[PDB]
Design a protein around this ligand. Structure first.
Ligand SMILES: [Ca+2]
Length: 304
């Protein structure tokens, strides 16, 4: 301004009240750092959520009485319910997931061994579904020579599909989808996975189902990713994998995971000459709220 001023030797201040309350179920906002940003206020800080420290920024605001109105944005890199593959046509690693900004997300990387090397999340899908407690969940992605495909579930007995030309990937599938199969909620519940069979033009779909004895997978096949699916092993007594045939005594559930793929690429090829399933399992008498179930990895190896 017009002149330089010195610090006083003795300080007196006026104060605002609290300028913002923590949003998002957080306990506190802390440790503020501020810069002027194009005539506006840009503030980062620490926060506490459920006892643990994280960080955040406030949306831009012009006047101090607006600080309490703007967004409070967690610094986050979560990729819940992921799908990992190398997209060979553009030599880029892909991590698809849910609970990002849009219905499904993807991130890119040049080295998937680094868990903090992923891009910020890009839109993979933006659509919604009706008749579902959860909304769209548990995406998986697979390509053939012509198209990339997105499949997903809804805890509602339906499996859904969208497609794009392969040259357009990576990118968003948009909002539209097509119902692929429908059954009771328990029979087509979640954790859809789709694979190509090594050496033949045939595809395998597995879907997690709710059984009387625990979670299990039902299998289907197709000769075209865009076609109809025929049941393979699809009852609880004769499942693709479940308590009836897993040989696993540490868990009843055989639940959301991935067949061991013989390639890292977008074709999701598996080799049924040694079919193996990396599943989540839990102690049989574990219980309580779904979020706290004590799931751990297990591996099934087909008895030939
Ligand atoms: Ca039903």
């Amino acid at each position: 301004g017009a002149m330089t001023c010195d610090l006083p030797t003795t300080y007196k201040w006026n104060s605002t009240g609290a300028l913002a309350q923590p949003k998002n179920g957080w306990t506190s906002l802390k440790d503020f750092t501020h810069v002027p940003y194009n005539g506006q206020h840009l503030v980062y800080g620490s926060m506490v959520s459920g006892g643990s420290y994280g960080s955040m920024n406030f949306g831009l605001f012009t006047d101090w009485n607006g600080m309490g109105s703007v967004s409070q944005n967690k610094m986050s890199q979560a990729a819940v319910a992921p799908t990992l593959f190398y997209f060979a046509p553009k030599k880029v690693w892909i991590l698809a997931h849910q609970w990002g900004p849009t219905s499904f997300s993807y991130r890119t990387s040049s080295d998937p061994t680094n868990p903090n090397g992923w891009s910020s999340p890009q839109p993979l899908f933006t659509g919604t579904i009706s008749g579902s407690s959860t909304g769209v969940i548990d995406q998986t992605v697979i390509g053939d020579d012509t198209n990339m495909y997105l499949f997903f579930a809804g805890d509602n007995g339906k499996i859904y599909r969208a497609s794009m030309p392969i040259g357009n990937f990576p990118g968003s599938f948009g909002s539209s989808s097509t119902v692929v199969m429908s059954d009771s909620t328990n029979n087509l519940f979640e954790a859809v996975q789709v694979y190509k069979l090594q050496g033949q033009t045939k595809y395998l779909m597995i879907v997690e189902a709710i059984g009387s004895q625990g979670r299990y997978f039902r299998s289907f096949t197709a000769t075209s990713l865009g076609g109809s699916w025929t049941p393979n092993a699809a009852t609880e007594s004769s499942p693709f994998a479940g308590k009836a045939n897993s040989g696993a005594t540490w868990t009843n559930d055989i639940s959301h995971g991935d067949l061991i793929r013989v390639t890292n690429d977008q074709t999701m090829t598996v080799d049924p000459c040694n079919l193996q399933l990396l599943y989540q399992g839990r102690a049989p008498n574990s219980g309580g709220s779904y979020n706290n179930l004590p799931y751990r990895p297990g591996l099934l190896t087909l008895q030939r």
